[PDB]
Subunit: 93 residues, 2 copies
């Protein structure tokens, strides 16, 4: 009866082995898929980093332009106030 | 002639002032646009961070599953080798 028990056990184990092999193949498949997805999102994130860097540079540049133009406008305003003061004095004689 | 020079200067300066005001308005417009774009890409980048985190968790989990299943398969293989050895010995008597 020993031999029959061993034969049955070997058939049971062969079924379990096949189950595990198919599980392993499934996990490997899914792993490759997820790795590809990781590669994709990482590349995407680098491109986004560069896009953000460009916008940040543009934003900072516009702020500096605002500062410069404000200074220029203040200058023009002062020049107008001065010219108008002189003109008013001349007109009043 | 002083008065005429001042009047001309004031007209010139008014033109320059208008030019600068329009420049400033343009820069402010563009600045708002770039700020909105920055907001958008930053939100996008956070979502990408979360997507990457999820994929990374899945990848690591599949690797651990591979380790576990390999150990289980090794066990089943050993059990089969042992059962087959005993059976061979019984058959040889």
């Amino acid at each position: 009866d020993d031999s029959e028990q061993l034969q049955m056990e070997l058939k049971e184990l062969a079924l379990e082995e096949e189950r595990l092999i198919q599980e392993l193949e499934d996990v490997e498949k899914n792993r490759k898929i997820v790795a590809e997805n990781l590669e994709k999102v990482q590349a995407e994130a680098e491109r986004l980093d560069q896009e953000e860097a460009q916008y940040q540079r543009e934003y900072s540049e516009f702020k500096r332009q605002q500062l410069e133009l404000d200074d220029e406008l203040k200058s023009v305003e002062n020049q107008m106030r001065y010219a108008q003061t002189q003109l008013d004095k001349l007109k009043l004689e």
